[PDB]
Amino acid sequence: TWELSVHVTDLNRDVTLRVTGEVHIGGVMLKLVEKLDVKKDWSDHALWWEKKRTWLLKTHWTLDKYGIQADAKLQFTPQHKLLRLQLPNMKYVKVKVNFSDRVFKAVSDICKTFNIRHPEELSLLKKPEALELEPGILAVSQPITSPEILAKMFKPQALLDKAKINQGWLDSSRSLMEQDVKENEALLLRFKYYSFFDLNPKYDAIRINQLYEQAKWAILLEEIECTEEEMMMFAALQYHINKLSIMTSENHLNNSDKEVDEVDAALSDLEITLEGGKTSTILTTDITPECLVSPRYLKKYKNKQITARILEAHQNVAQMSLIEAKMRFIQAWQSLPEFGITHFIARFQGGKKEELIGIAYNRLIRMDASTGDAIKTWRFSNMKQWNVNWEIKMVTVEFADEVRLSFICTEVDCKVVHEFIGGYIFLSTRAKDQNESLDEEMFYKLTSGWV
């Protein structure tokens, strides 16, 4: 007859109970509701064991089966808790989500209510005026208010500082409660894996918009490098998207793919002269560079000279539909040399410095921490298996023909790296999949089934 302490988080009231290993979780919860006497809606409350970071959800299991013994300290706490999510468009949305669900499932439910297909590509990332949803508002891009906003958060980083952000990717196989996430905390919702399956304008207005927004901020903040010519084309595309995204007279077509010829100001062919195509459908633009290029451009060049280069690039964009332009922006980003690599600090045998391991959808890359250069590449198509040695925090990947790669990371980075490798192998299976729905069972096997 050992003692069981229970703190009720939303009442801030403690309760002791005399129990055996053979008492059921349901019995503790029913016993606990009596001893309190006060009656309220308990339906969302579950037992949580902070010491072992374990939810005690199965009411028909014994304390013994969950491993609880003398003077164990539990919380009786709501499973659902407020979370602030920062979307790829940098707006915050408040959601009350189940802090006992696996993060993979939480992300799936978030993406379902946001109408984002392929939730397996997205996840939650810890951070280093909340948006109230309107119909289809997550499909709508806005211009940036101010160069100041951009200039402010434009704090350029070395690759090593960029690699440290990746320590914060949540474990998809554990709940938010298990990962030191608190009520009212802000998490980033991001595209995590850079292998985007079947982007389809017919179904994916929101998915394409949020992916475009993630790309746009990465380019404007120089988190990914591009050439000056590419920057001028990114500027022309953003200008065109911003202009088409004005829809004053309708609220119900946010998910539609707007055509230039549909804009109120558009001139029909043959309206001005029986010479079609002699003038632009939009006769007048208002291109200015300040919110279309990264801050380094306005330091290098006169406003007039940047404007002329954007106008030159815009010649190619002016007849694109809204979603066509977003997809061309995404396709130009996908073509960038360092696209789709996630960096981790790593040490290699014979290395005297911190280096990087880069993970991409099809390969691992040993990379220089101060140039970003690819020193060596190993292909997933050659991978047999991998080992995590938790005592020395060493990942060893085995490839065909007796090729082995070993590197050392922080313990947190090892866990994140393991999930990225399994996650990308899981994503590579989607092309051959004959199931109607996502094979979540295989995802969990490839990422958490082993260790």
Side-chain angles (χ1 to χ4, degrees):
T1 317
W2 73 55
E3 277 196 337
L4 194 68
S5 303
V6 180
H7 180 246
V8 186
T9 58
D10 56 338
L11 302 189
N12 198 320
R13 279 181 61 189
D14 291 276
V15 176
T16 304
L17 296 168
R18 265 166 256 123
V19 294
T20 312
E22 282 166 335
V23 169
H24 303 100
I25 294 300
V28 174
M29 294 166 69
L30 293 171
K31 297 228 207 205
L32 176 73
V33 161
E34 289 187 346
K35 289 277 197 190
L36 286 172
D37 204 320
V38 64
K39 73 197 165 185
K40 55 168 293 193
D41 182 16
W42 290 110
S43 52
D44 197 42
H45 281 65
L47 289 167
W48 165 250
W49 191 17
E50 179 63 36
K51 182 164 190 207
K52 287 291 211 298
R53 300 201 169 200
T54 303
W55 286 102
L56 313 177
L57 299 187
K58 289 177 187 310
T59 59
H60 62 296
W61 281 22
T62 54
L63 289 170
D64 205 319
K65 197 151 194 290
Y66 268 120
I68 300 160
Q69 283 145 26
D71 301 285
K73 288 137 58 58
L74 309 182
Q75 298 174 30
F76 199 51
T77 196
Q79 290 172 95
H80 292 82
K81 307 192 187 300
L82 273 181
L83 196 64
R84 288 177 293 127
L85 289 179
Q86 191 182 47
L87 302 204
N89 68 4
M90 301 307 275
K91 294 307 210 160
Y92 289 85
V93 177
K94 301 195 176 204
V95 294
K96 200 174 181 175
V97 284
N98 193 331
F99 270 52
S100 81
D101 278 346
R102 290 182 287 187
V103 158
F104 191 82
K105 172 172 189 310
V107 169
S108 184
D109 291 342
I110 290 161
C111 287
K112 182 75 198 298
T113 203
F114 290 173
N115 188 32
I116 297 169
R117 293 197 307 136
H118 288 293
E120 67 276 9
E121 298 165 3
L122 293 95
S123 200
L124 301 175
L125 175 61
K126 288 182 193 172
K127 291 183 83 76
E129 297 163 44
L131 176 65
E132 192 64 54
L133 296 194
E134 302 171 18
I137 200 169
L138 294 185
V140 181
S141 187
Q142 284 203 308
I144 309 113
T145 325
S146 89
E148 290 72 36
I149 291 288
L150 193 59
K152 162 143 193 186
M153 57 178 130
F154 174 68
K155 195 171 167 181
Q157 278 182 301
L159 265 171
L160 284 174
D161 293 317
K162 172 179 192 65
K164 285 160 198 296
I165 293 161
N166 294 313
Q167 292 189 288
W169 289 103
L170 294 201
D171 181 346
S172 294
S173 285
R174 296 177 85 197
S175 70
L176 292 167
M177 196 78 174
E178 294 164 68
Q179 305 192 62
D180 191 41
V181 177
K182 306 302 188 209
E183 188 157 29
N184 295 305
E185 186 160 332
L187 291 180
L188 281 40
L189 174 66
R190 292 286 181 280
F191 296 87
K192 174 175 179 190
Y193 298 101
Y194 292 100
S195 192
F196 306 119
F197 200 81
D198 183 38
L199 288 168
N200 182 350
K202 177 173 187 193
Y203 298 89
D204 288 346
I206 292 153
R207 179 188 182 210
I208 289 163
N209 182 59
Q210 292 297 327
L211 185 56
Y212 157 65
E213 291 269 15
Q214 183 165 316
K216 179 197 74 170
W217 283 102
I219 287 154
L220 291 176
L221 294 176
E222 295 191 340
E223 291 173 353
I224 189 164
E225 178 176 25
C226 65
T227 68
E228 296 203 3
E229 174 170 24
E230 290 168 333
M231 177 69 66
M232 299 302 101
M233 180 58 71
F234 287 129
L237 288 165
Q238 187 195 158
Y239 172 78
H240 188 71
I241 290 163
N242 288 346
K243 277 285 133 184
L244 280 182
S245 295
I246 299 152
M247 302 193 329
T248 312
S249 54
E250 61 251 39
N251 314 308
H252 73 289
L253 299 168
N254 286 337
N255 290 56
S256 77
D257 177 23
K258 181 175 278 301
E259 298 276 354
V260 175
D261 292 328
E262 283 155 16
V263 167
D264 287 322
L267 297 145
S268 318
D269 273 16
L270 308 176
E271 188 170 352
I272 298 172
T273 176
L274 298 192
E275 190 175 337
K278 186 188 176 190
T279 61
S280 308
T281 295
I282 198 182
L283 247 189
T284 312
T285 55
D286 63 346
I287 298 180
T288 197
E290 69 180 346
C291 293
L292 297 184
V293 298
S294 69
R296 88 179 176 99
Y297 284 82
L298 311 162
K299 286 172 194 230
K300 183 165 175 193
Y301 297 118
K302 290 283 183 145
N303 191 303
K304 170 182 212 293
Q305 267 72 28
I306 304 164
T307 303
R309 303 169 72 186
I310 302 173
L311 277 169
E312 188 168 37
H314 187 256
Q315 290 278 110
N316 300 295
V317 175
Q319 296 306 296
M320 294 179 180
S321 78
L322 176 56
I323 298 181
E324 172 177 16
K326 291 185 186 180
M327 289 292 296
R328 294 298 294 142
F329 193 107
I330 291 164
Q331 294 165 349
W333 170 65
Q334 287 173 309
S335 79
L336 296 179
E338 303 310 324
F339 173 77
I341 305 168
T342 307
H343 304 86
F344 298 88
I345 299 173
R347 284 186 159 275
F348 298 82
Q349 193 158 244
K352 297 182 173 161
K353 298 178 173 216
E354 292 187 329
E355 295 178 56
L356 300 169
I357 191 75
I359 312 180
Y361 83 101
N362 61 347
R363 66 202 193 278
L364 293 179
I365 318 165
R366 172 175 190 174
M367 309 182 70
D368 188 276
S370 80
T371 71
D373 295 318
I375 299 322
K376 190 165 187 196
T377 302
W378 300 258
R379 303 206 85 77
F380 288 157
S381 65
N382 287 327
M383 199 169 58
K384 304 297 179 67
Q385 66 159 73
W386 70 100
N387 190 69
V388 186
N389 181 334
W390 293 105
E391 299 310 311
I392 57 164
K393 299 105 181 72
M394 166 173 86
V395 180
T396 302
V397 188
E398 313 217 49
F399 301 86
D401 296 329
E402 310 284 48
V403 180
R404 293 164 207 100
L405 162 62
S406 288
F407 55 88
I408 296 174
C409 292
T410 63
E411 184 192 359
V412 51
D413 288 301
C414 280
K415 298 186 168 174
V416 173
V417 165
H418 169 70
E419 178 175 326
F420 262 99
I421 299 171
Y424 270 128
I425 303 308
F426 173 70
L427 298 186
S428 78
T429 71
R430 290 177 301 169
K432 78 170 202 42
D433 179 36
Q434 299 304 303
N435 291 292
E436 187 175 38
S437 72
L438 186 66
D439 193 347
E440 298 174 334
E441 185 180 17
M442 191 201 321
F443 168 82
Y444 289 128
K445 292 177 172 171
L446 288 170
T447 54
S448 58
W450 319 102
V451 208

